[PDB]
Structure 1
Amino acid sequence: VGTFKAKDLIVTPAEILKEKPDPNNLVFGTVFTDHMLTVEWSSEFGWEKPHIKPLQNLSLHPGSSALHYAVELFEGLKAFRGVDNKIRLFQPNLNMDRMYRSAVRATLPVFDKEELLECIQQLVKLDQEWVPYSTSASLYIRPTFIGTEPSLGVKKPTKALLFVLLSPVGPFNPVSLWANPKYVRAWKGGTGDCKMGGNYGSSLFAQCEAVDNGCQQVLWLYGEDHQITEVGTMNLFLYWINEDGEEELATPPLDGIILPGVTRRCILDLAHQWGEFKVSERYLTMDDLTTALEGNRVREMFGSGTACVVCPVSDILYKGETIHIPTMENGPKLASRILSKLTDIQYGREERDWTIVL
């Protein structure tokens, strides 16, 4: 093993810098900044020196294993231009931890998390003017790692590329969910608890079917009893009165088929800290959900992820019926409290160990 080292960065600035977009009309993942991080690896020579250089197309051998066998993984985190014009990262160490565990499970080569994070900070610092001047926009950071092995054997790659992209993004509009148990996102003994690209390609067909029935996202069901696991690429929370008449924030447990979201983590830590209601990592079925609905026990349902922070759910289509979820008719008080909190930390209105300053 070894690692590229940030003290070795080679930097090659763009000649012609691009005009920044309007913060208030930005579609996610659509606009990229001026520069990118690339680092090459080979089993023969190990990790090359890291480059920050102008955003450009990748030159890949058409046999590259990323293209044939989905030898690939990614992350997603954000930079925030704070109320004090200071640029913060949020919980970035948790993303480095996750990206490392993904690399191991993908058989891609390991790296030093601290060195990566310090390369990412130099990238953002170079393009810091792309970090939106706005309190409802951010800069999305997309570390990506791919096998570039030029041979068609299914095997651990002997060549790889780690690269990082920057994209400015903007922004409740509740969501409707499509729940069809014929599709299964992830299985025990599979990779659904890692952020490996192979888990996502198989979802596009279900998403299209979702939009065809006028839903915005897929509710991922699992098992004979139709456990509700995730919502699109978001963790799922239920705020309700449970079977014993207690107020509870519940979310599926990490038993292999749930991606351990940073946002999910932060929300559980906030809820534990507040001490106002029971906080439960536990199994939730559609029948638990509908039984609770025809007893008025449900308050809120929402998804969580880095992109939206929190995403309220208003309806589920299941077995030919639209099932109303009273999230918006209950405020949504919890959802909004969580958003305000996380936003406060992110933009440095509130001071906490969750952010790092550039």
Structure 2
Amino acid sequence: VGTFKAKDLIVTPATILKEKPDPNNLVFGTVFTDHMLTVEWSSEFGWEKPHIKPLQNLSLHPGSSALHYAVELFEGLKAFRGVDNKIRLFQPNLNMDRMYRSAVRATLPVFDKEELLECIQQLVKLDQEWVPYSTSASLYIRPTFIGTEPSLGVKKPTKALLFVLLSPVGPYFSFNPVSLWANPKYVRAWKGGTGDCKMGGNYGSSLFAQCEAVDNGCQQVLWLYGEDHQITEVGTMNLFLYWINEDGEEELATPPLDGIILPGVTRRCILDLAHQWGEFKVSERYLTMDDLTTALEGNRVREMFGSGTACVVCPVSDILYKGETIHIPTMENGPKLASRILSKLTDIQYGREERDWTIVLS
């Protein structure tokens, strides 16, 4: 057991540089930077030294287990160029904590979280001119970790690769509210499954549901669970509901961490904000379609929104379910809370206000 170490970094700088794109025209996940990070591991010898080097294709044995049995996991986080022109990461240690836990769930080897973070910082620092010059764009950071065992046995891999990609991305907006496809025939995650980790195999199974959703005029899938049709998540975002609850109290509600919900960083931040403001009840609790339709009949719903790293906050206007369109009155209610959370988090990400949630580049 052990870890690679950032002090052993080997840097092979590119000698031909790609042109930076316009920050207003960026499509998500499609343009990549000049460099990547790579680190090899074998059970025989452990972790090899980390490399930063020019972006390149991966050379993989076709029997690699990432390709047959989904022995894989990823993370997502961002670097933000401040109004003061300092580049900041936001809650990055939470992503490392999650990554490590995911590795263990997947049977990939463990590593030292602080050491990975430092390696990420030096990567971003080398490609730092790729962090956009714009207050509603950013650099998305994709750490990825795959089994490369050359063998078709289903088992723990004895070889693996950890790598990191960088991709400048732009605003999810200029506030666009979404319609949701709620079809109970599909289930993202089950008790005793891996839905509370960022493991590749949770996502394969959902491209078909996203396609069905667009064919019916919807932008995202609302994931339902169990016999009472609990509402769990929105696409790949956590779900919040701002309403007057069944006892007539103003409440922010979100599903609890009971194994079928991914514990988002955004989710966490929001809950901490809500707790600290102390202005309404905050509840991690079960929410069903009927709870929801009953609330709508009695004018109790203020706002519904997704949260996650790509969107930050994503207002919901409509849910399609049992052959009908159910309107959600989010945009008619400001959306006051959603806009508050958005301006608070973006103020922090871009250094418009001080916070312990940000780290300035190393």
Distance in 2 between residues matched to 1:245 and 1:26, nearest whole Å: 45
Question: Aligned-pair distance for 1:201?
Answer: 0.1
CA distance in 1 between counterparts of 2:313 and 2:6 reads: 34
Structure 2 CA distance, aligned partners of 1:169 and 1:244? 43
Q: Give a deviation string over 1:70-118, Cα, whole Å, max 9, x none.
A: 0000000000000110000000000000000000000000000000000
Residues 262-321 of structure 1: per-residue CA shift (max 9 Å, x gap): 000000000001111100000000000000000010010000000000000000000000
- 1 CA distance for matches of 2:170 and 2:339? 18
Q: State the shift of 1:187 in Å.
A: 0.2
- How far apart, CA to CA, are the structure 2 residues paired with 1:226 and 1:127? 46
Shift of 1:241: 0.4
Aligned counterpart for 1:254 among listed residues 257, 263, 279: 257
Q: For structure 2, which runs of at least 5 residues remain unmatched after alignment? A: none
Q: CA deviation at 1:194?
A: 0.2
Distance 1:81 1:302 in 2: 26
What is the alpha-carbon distance in structure 2 between the residues aligned to residue 154 and residue 335 of structure 1? 45
The CA distance in 1 between the partners of 2:208 and 2:20, in whole Å, is 34
CA distance in 2 between partners of 1:297 and 1:169 (Å): 37
Whole-Å separation in 1 of the counterparts to 2:304 and 2:22 = 32
Q: Secondary structure in 1 aligned to 2:125? A: helix
Q: Which residue of 2 aligns with 1:2?
A: 2
Paired with 2:21 and 2:318, the residues of 1 have a C-alpha distance of 34
Match of 2:267 among 264, 276, 279: 264
**Partners of 1:356 and 1:41 in 2: CA distance:** 29
Distance in 1, Cα, partners of 2:317 & 2:248? 23
Aligned length: 358
CA distance in 2, matches of 1:120, 1:113: 11
- Per the normalisation by structure 1, the TM-score is 1.00
The alignment's TM-score, normalised by the length of structure 2, stands at 0.99
Rounded Cα–Cα distance in structure 1 between residues aligned with 2:267 and 2:27: 24
Partner Cα separation in structure 1 for residue 58 and residue 223 of structure 2: 33
CA distance in 2, matches of 1:354, 1:61: 41
* RMSD, matched Cα: 0.4
1:1-358 matched pairs, under 5 angstroms: 1-171=1-171, 172-358=175-361
CA distance in 2, matches of 1:21, 1:300: 36
Distance 1:87 1:78 in 2: 10
Q: Work out the CA distance in 1 between the residues paired with 2:69 and 2:314.
A: 32
Matched residue SS, 1:3: coil
Question: 1:344, 1:238 → 2: CA distance?
Answer: 23
Distance 2:30 2:311 in 1: 16
Q: Deviations over 1:40-80 (max 9, x none)?
A: 00000100000000000000000000000000000000000
- State the distance in 2 between where 1:332 and 1:165 align: 35
- How many Å separate the matches in 2 of 1:174 and 1:242? 23
Q: CA deviation at 1:347?
A: 0.5
Q: CA deviation at 1:130?
A: 0.2
Work out the CA distance in 2 between the residues paired with 1:218 and 1:225. 18
Q: SS of 1:23's equivalent?
A: coil
> SS of the counterpart of 2:262?
coil
Secondary structure class of the residue paired with 2:316: strand
Structure 1 stretches of at least 4 aligned residues deviating more than 3 Å after TM superposition: none
- 1:283 & 1:99 partners in 2: Cα distance? 26
Structure 1 position 229, deviation (Å): 0.2
Instruction: Flag structure 1 segments of 5+ consecutive residues without an equivalent.
Output: none
Q: Distance in 1 between matches of 2:278 and 2:108?
A: 41
Deviations 1:160-187 (A, max 9, x none): 0000000000111000000000000000
How far apart are 1:240 and its partner, in Å? Answer: 0.4
Secondary structure of residue in 2 paired with 1:84: coil
Q: How much has 1:191 moved relative to structure 2? A: 0.3
Cα shift at 1:2? 0.6
